[PDB]
Amino acid sequence: GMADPSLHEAQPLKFIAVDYCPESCTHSPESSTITLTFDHRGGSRWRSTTRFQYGTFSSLIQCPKGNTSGLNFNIYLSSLEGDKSQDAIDFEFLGKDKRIVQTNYYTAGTGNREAIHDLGFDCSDGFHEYVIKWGPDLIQWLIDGKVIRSVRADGEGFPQKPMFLYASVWDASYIDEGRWTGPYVGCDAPYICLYKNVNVPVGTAV
Ligand SMILES: OC[C@H]1O[C@@H](O[C@@H]2[C@@H](O)[C@H](O[C@H]3[C@H](O)[C@@H](O)[C@H](O[C@H]4[C@H](O)[C@@H](O)[C@@H](O)O[C@@H]4CO)O[C@@H]3CO)O[C@H](CO)[C@H]2O)[C@H](O)[C@@H](O)[C@@H]1O
């Protein structure tokens, strides 16, 4: 009993696109780091250049410092951002409180499956690991190696369309009178959200 016998499959996300405002996204593939910045310019959004059909997705993430009230930073899967009938699976940080994270998923445009989780840490205090495990009848969310939520196919729809990996930072303060992410204060810009060692499924790109 010397070798670790534990079964251990993922590949680094090498190729990404930026959907708007590329000046507020940086990619350093040589250090496996992507950053997103929120400031006057209005944020940005990156994504994988390919869709995937199921698999495990992960990133180290360090959220922005300072007063992030109003902001939404995230990492998520979506069949197509902006599609009214999208399938999706979310990690969304709510800027009013950097010690929580919200999970959610969408089936043919329908969400309303929010859950709020206590992180046990400040998400801007160093890099932490966020994982989405997406299967045909089981979705799991992991944080620093621990499952924080599991949902199984319950007959009320399930994400099954091929999906892009996405990440953005945006001002969500207009949602629910600012009660969701807080009012936007925005006096600590640039708000820099960092993604490191983003990994995608080995063999499910479609
Ligand atoms: O131009 C006026 C106004 O524009 C602002 O920038 C907006 C920006 O707010 C918007 O953010 C998207 C974001 O890119 C996207 O990732 C996010 O996706 C959601 C998804 O819709 C949900 O279903 C769920 O899965 O969770 C995801 C992650 O939160 O949705 C937001 C909101 O639509 O993107 C648009 C471009 O498409 C962009 O114009 C800008 O900040 C302001 O300064 C400006 O006034």
mmCIF file of C-alpha atoms in Angstrom, residues 14-118:
data_model
loop_
_atom_site.group_PDB
_atom_site.id
_atom_site.type_symbol
_atom_site.label_atom_id
_atom_site.label_comp_id
_atom_site.label_asym_id
_atom_site.label_seq_id
_atom_site.Cartn_x
_atom_site.Cartn_y
_atom_site.Cartn_z
ATOM 1 C CA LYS A 14 -7.423 25.550 -24.073
ATOM 2 C CA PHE A 15 -9.711 27.455 -26.441
ATOM 3 C CA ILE A 16 -12.104 30.237 -25.493
ATOM 4 C CA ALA A 17 -14.198 32.978 -27.066
ATOM 5 C CA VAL A 18 -15.242 36.341 -25.659
ATOM 6 C CA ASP A 19 -18.846 37.384 -26.408
ATOM 7 C CA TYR A 20 -18.454 41.117 -25.721
ATOM 8 C CA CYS A 21 -16.041 43.740 -24.394
ATOM 9 C CA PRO A 22 -12.794 41.740 -24.836
ATOM 10 C CA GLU A 23 -10.863 44.599 -23.245
ATOM 11 C CA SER A 24 -12.390 43.418 -19.934
ATOM 12 C CA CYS A 25 -11.211 39.836 -20.295
ATOM 13 C CA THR A 26 -7.630 38.564 -20.193
ATOM 14 C CA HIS A 27 -6.357 35.158 -21.150
ATOM 15 C CA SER A 28 -2.957 33.878 -20.099
ATOM 16 C CA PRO A 29 -3.001 30.307 -21.359
ATOM 17 C CA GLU A 30 0.666 29.872 -20.334
ATOM 18 C CA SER A 31 -0.344 30.354 -16.677
ATOM 19 C CA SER A 32 -3.794 28.788 -17.230
ATOM 20 C CA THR A 33 -5.512 31.919 -16.016
ATOM 21 C CA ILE A 34 -8.502 33.847 -17.336
ATOM 22 C CA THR A 35 -9.687 37.068 -15.738
ATOM 23 C CA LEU A 36 -12.889 39.063 -16.044
ATOM 24 C CA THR A 37 -13.132 42.721 -14.991
ATOM 25 C CA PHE A 38 -16.158 44.763 -14.029
ATOM 26 C CA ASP A 39 -15.887 48.547 -14.297
ATOM 27 C CA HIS A 40 -17.497 51.415 -16.319
ATOM 28 C CA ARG A 41 -17.110 49.337 -19.445
ATOM 29 C CA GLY A 42 -19.837 46.959 -18.215
ATOM 30 C CA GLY A 43 -18.151 43.590 -17.754
ATOM 31 C CA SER A 44 -17.475 40.692 -20.101
ATOM 32 C CA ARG A 45 -18.220 37.027 -20.717
ATOM 33 C CA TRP A 46 -16.028 34.185 -21.901
ATOM 34 C CA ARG A 47 -16.989 30.735 -23.109
ATOM 35 C CA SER A 48 -15.636 27.489 -24.494
ATOM 36 C CA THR A 49 -15.514 27.456 -28.303
ATOM 37 C CA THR A 50 -17.243 24.086 -28.310
ATOM 38 C CA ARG A 51 -20.350 22.615 -26.716
ATOM 39 C CA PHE A 52 -20.196 19.424 -24.631
ATOM 40 C CA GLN A 53 -22.633 16.560 -24.084
ATOM 41 C CA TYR A 54 -22.345 15.831 -20.339
ATOM 42 C CA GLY A 55 -19.206 15.598 -18.239
ATOM 43 C CA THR A 56 -17.298 17.202 -15.393
ATOM 44 C CA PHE A 57 -16.373 20.887 -15.525
ATOM 45 C CA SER A 58 -14.158 22.683 -13.031
ATOM 46 C CA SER A 59 -12.331 25.876 -12.251
ATOM 47 C CA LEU A 60 -10.314 27.447 -9.483
ATOM 48 C CA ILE A 61 -11.988 30.803 -8.853
ATOM 49 C CA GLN A 62 -11.012 33.877 -6.870
ATOM 50 C CA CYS A 63 -13.787 36.454 -6.766
ATOM 51 C CA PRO A 64 -13.237 40.236 -6.720
ATOM 52 C CA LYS A 65 -12.099 42.097 -3.623
ATOM 53 C CA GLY A 66 -13.810 45.148 -2.151
ATOM 54 C CA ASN A 67 -17.509 45.933 -1.913
ATOM 55 C CA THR A 68 -19.054 43.747 -4.571
ATOM 56 C CA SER A 69 -22.691 44.556 -3.760
ATOM 57 C CA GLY A 70 -24.904 44.344 -6.855
ATOM 58 C CA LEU A 71 -22.485 42.226 -8.892
ATOM 59 C CA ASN A 72 -22.974 38.695 -10.157
ATOM 60 C CA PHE A 73 -19.859 36.638 -10.818
ATOM 61 C CA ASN A 74 -20.275 33.099 -11.999
ATOM 62 C CA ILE A 75 -19.357 29.972 -13.882
ATOM 63 C CA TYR A 76 -22.047 28.006 -15.672
ATOM 64 C CA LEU A 77 -23.140 25.707 -18.484
ATOM 65 C CA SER A 78 -25.698 26.883 -21.028
ATOM 66 C CA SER A 79 -26.952 25.503 -24.345
ATOM 67 C CA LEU A 80 -26.847 29.117 -25.609
ATOM 68 C CA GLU A 81 -26.701 32.327 -23.581
ATOM 69 C CA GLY A 82 -29.750 34.440 -24.391
ATOM 70 C CA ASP A 83 -31.802 31.507 -25.712
ATOM 71 C CA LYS A 84 -35.341 31.581 -24.265
ATOM 72 C CA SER A 85 -35.481 27.766 -24.207
ATOM 73 C CA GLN A 86 -32.006 27.084 -22.857
ATOM 74 C CA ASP A 87 -30.770 24.238 -20.689
ATOM 75 C CA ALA A 88 -28.299 25.471 -18.054
ATOM 76 C CA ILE A 89 -26.489 24.707 -14.785
ATOM 77 C CA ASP A 90 -25.196 27.554 -12.584
ATOM 78 C CA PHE A 91 -22.771 28.665 -9.928
ATOM 79 C CA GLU A 92 -23.663 32.312 -9.232
ATOM 80 C CA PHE A 93 -22.031 34.405 -6.529
ATOM 81 C CA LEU A 94 -24.243 37.185 -5.179
ATOM 82 C CA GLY A 95 -22.076 40.245 -4.628
ATOM 83 C CA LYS A 96 -23.879 41.474 -1.496
ATOM 84 C CA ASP A 97 -22.482 38.470 0.409
ATOM 85 C CA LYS A 98 -19.202 36.819 -0.587
ATOM 86 C CA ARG A 99 -19.703 34.028 1.942
ATOM 87 C CA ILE A 100 -22.512 32.377 -0.043
ATOM 88 C CA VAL A 101 -23.064 30.964 -3.518
ATOM 89 C CA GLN A 102 -26.286 30.249 -5.400
ATOM 90 C CA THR A 103 -26.820 27.138 -7.496
ATOM 91 C CA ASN A 104 -29.592 26.735 -10.061
ATOM 92 C CA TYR A 105 -30.440 24.923 -13.272
ATOM 93 C CA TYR A 106 -32.678 25.450 -16.281
ATOM 94 C CA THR A 107 -34.721 23.122 -18.452
ATOM 95 C CA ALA A 108 -36.097 24.500 -21.737
ATOM 96 C CA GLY A 109 -36.000 28.030 -20.339
ATOM 97 C CA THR A 110 -37.466 27.215 -16.931
ATOM 98 C CA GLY A 111 -35.342 27.778 -13.842
ATOM 99 C CA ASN A 112 -36.697 28.536 -10.373
ATOM 100 C CA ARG A 113 -34.489 25.931 -8.715
ATOM 101 C CA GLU A 114 -32.306 28.291 -6.714
ATOM 102 C CA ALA A 115 -30.488 27.083 -3.624
ATOM 103 C CA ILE A 116 -28.250 29.200 -1.410
ATOM 104 C CA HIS A 117 -25.161 27.652 0.165
ATOM 105 C CA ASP A 118 -22.902 28.841 2.961
#
